[PDB]
Design a protein around this ligand. Structure first.
Ligand SMILES: [Zn+2]
Ligand SMILES: [Zn+2]
Lengths: 309, 218, 223
């Protein structure tokens, strides 16, 4: 790393400690900046589908294009029914631009969810059915709008429990929104997004959603599920936990910004405490979103470590 | 022109030529007409970070003064150079929002926002000032903040954050600062609920900065 | 006297106040002497950021100016022309220092390499925005710098590497002739690698740093 002193004229965070940084450094090759006291100010602000994740999914219909999915193995006991009614008693209240509207609960026993599906594919389709070729700035945008959705879920302490690329939906490039949120009552499909810490067996940590989001960024940057040729989940699943295996950061496309590779790398941190929280991720993605217009198509001769320690 | 001047300002931010954004943007306020709820944020973001460049540089050169030897004289005159440019731009935004904006927002709660700015800019002069000016300036700053009252709203928390840090950094009275910040933080976190339509994207940060500032002062 | 002017520069740099730093260093050139390698270095980094904040700004303006009414469009272009006008002035300024006070006195072997390189880079930015036979003027400045440096400096020397890097991206970004860029970059990388058996202990960093940036560029042109 090489460094320059920099004033940050915009909301930005100190990568060592994730606190706000007004004044300090930038790694001129990496953006990372050392944590080098003052109080903070106020910043500037400006038909069947399948068993599903853990509920069998149907293209149901009622007024408002509401699809349906049904309980799997968890029995509709009154304790769990009450917990579901309480979780619904959050989700049916929250509405957010990057979240699909939770519309209500099916009144019959063997509970089922009524929630809107917006036309345009699951993100799973654009990745693995096609790998639809589109501008990299829209890859950042997808990451932004998904992240900004997850930011509200975390801003509401909704933990996704089992976030997957399949449960993310694109309005034909108009926007992306999050499904499969909350509803932890039914949990305990397929699994590459489980954090290593969880597969070492509160696994639905506030920060476990971070790791799953990390896997989504890999798929965006690489066009594929992780572990391209070690595909036996049941073989890799334990050992991605036990410390052997993590997704190959080299498979990213050569024209991605170094910082996005870096963001993914910090996102995939195994030790939970400092997997970055989503406000910082959002700020990082917000920096990339305008950095990509700024950065030149090819590198040049920097100022040679001019103001490092 | 008004559509234009705001247009140049909107570009100038993307160009990061904030100095030119301020020179343009206050040309809107010198129309004497009321600012839109957008124009207010563009004015405040221009002048804050335009001064921001001077504040951080003033901190650095003052730091290497303190760490310093005949070069001390060069450093001291340069500190006065950056201080006058800071002082002079800060007087500008003060004179502007005193001369125009505060008297022309009646019962729009921009009436709070412009008092908060008046507080902040005197607060920045109170960093520059020495013993003589400091009290004369600080009195004027506190009148602004203490008047700047009308509940999760970013501004009300923004005032409380900013105003509590005024008490900590400049009055050096942690009892007030802790008292304010903790009080205002509870009145946020006990309440929330507005967040999505409030654009929690803002108010959570200020709410967090209260928590961790308290953690610094505690 | 420069002990004074140069202190302000070293002070202005860390004060992050480059617009002031570049003016004082200009008066450092007004002494007409051979600059020591440090005050030579300051001058290069001063004008690098003083264009850099404006050149990179010019990129964003010309990016937003892509989009399609007239009022917004003509203002976007008018603003672009202003920032472009600013860039053109400070560019022609540094070249006047190079032409009138540095190159004519660059008696030491490396010194003339550094200034001729910089005469390359600054013409490169100007032709980047600018009718622009200045592309060829930068080509000449680099070719002069490369012709000399090929003989009078070690293939692991950071300026020789840094010259090669800038010159290769000139062939890429300005002439769009990537095989030429491949040629320069591949040679300069391989030659310094062949010389890794000795490095000066600071050049150790800067050389390996620049080499890694050179290896990155090879990828984006090679892929
Ligand atoms: Zn680095
Ligand atoms: Zn930090």
């Amino acid at each position: 790393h090489n460094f320059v002193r920099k004033t940050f004229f915009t909301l930005a965070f100190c990568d060592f400690c994730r606190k706000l940084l007004f004044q300090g450094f930038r790694c001129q090759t990496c953006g990372y900046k050392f944590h080098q006291d003052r109080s903070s100010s106020a910043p500037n602000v400006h038909q069947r589908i399948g068993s599903g994740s853990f509920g069998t999914v149907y293209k149901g219909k009622w007024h408002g294009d509401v699809a349906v999915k049904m309980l799997n193995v968890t029995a509709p006991t009154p304790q769990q029914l009450q917990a579901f009614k309480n979780e619904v008693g959050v989700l049916r209240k929250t509405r957010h631009v990057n979240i699909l509207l939770f519309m209500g609960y099916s009144t019959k026993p063997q509970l089922a969810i009524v929630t809107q599906w917006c036309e345009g594919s699951s993100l799973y389709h654009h990745l693995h059915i096609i790998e639809t070729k589109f501008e990299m700035i829209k890859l950042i945008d997808i990451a932004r709008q998904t992240a900004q959705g997850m930011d509200y879920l975390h801003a509401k302490s909704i933990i996704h429990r089992d976030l997957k690329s399949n449960n993310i939906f694109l309005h034909e490039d108009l926007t992306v929104k999050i499904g499969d949120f909350g509803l932890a009552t039914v949990k305990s499909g397929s699994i590459l997004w489980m954090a290593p810490e969880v597969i070492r067996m509160n696994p639905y940590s506030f920060q476990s959603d971070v790791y799953a989001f990390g896997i989504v960024l890999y798929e965006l940057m690489t066009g594929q599920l992780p572990y391209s040729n070690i595909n036996n989940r049941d073989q890799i699943i334990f050992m991605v936990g036990r410390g052997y295996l993590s997704p190959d950061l080299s498979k990213v496309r050569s024209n991605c910004p170094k910082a996005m590779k870096r963001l993914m790398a910090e996102c995939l941190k195994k030790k939970r405490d400092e997997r970055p929280l989503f406000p910082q991720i959002l700020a990082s993605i917000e920096l990339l979103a305008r950095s990509l217009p700024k950065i030149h198509r090819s590198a040049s001769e920097p100022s040679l470590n001019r103001a490092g320690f | 022109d008004k559509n234009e001047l705001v247009q140049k300002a909107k570009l100038a931010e993307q160009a990061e030529r904030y100095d030119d954004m301020a020179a343009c943007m206050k040309s809107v306020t010198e129309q004497g007409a009321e600012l839109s709820n957008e124009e207010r944020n563009l004015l405040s973001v221009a002048y804050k970070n335009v001064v921001g460049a001077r504040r951080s540089s003033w901190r650095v050169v003052s730091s290497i003064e303190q760490k310093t030897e005949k070069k001390q004289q060069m450093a001291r005159e340069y500190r006065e150079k950056i201080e006058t440019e800071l002082r002079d731009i800060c007087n500008d935004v003060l004179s502007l929002l005193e001369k125009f904006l505060i008297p022309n927002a009646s019962q729009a709660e921009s009436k709070v926002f412009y008092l908060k700015m008046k507080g902040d800019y005197y607060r920045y002069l109170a960093e520059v000032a020495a013993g003589d000016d400091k009290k004369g300036i600080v009195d004027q700053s506190q009148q602004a903040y203490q008047e700047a009252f009308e509940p999760t709203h970013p501004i009300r928390l923004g005032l409380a954050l900013n105003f509590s840090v005024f008490y900590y950094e400049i009055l050096n009275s942690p009892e007030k600062a802790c008292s304010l910040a903790k009080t205002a933080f509870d009145e946020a976190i006990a309440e929330l609920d507005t967040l999505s339509e409030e654009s929690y994207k803002d108010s959570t940060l200020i709410m967090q900065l209260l928590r961790d500032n308290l953690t610094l002062w505690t």
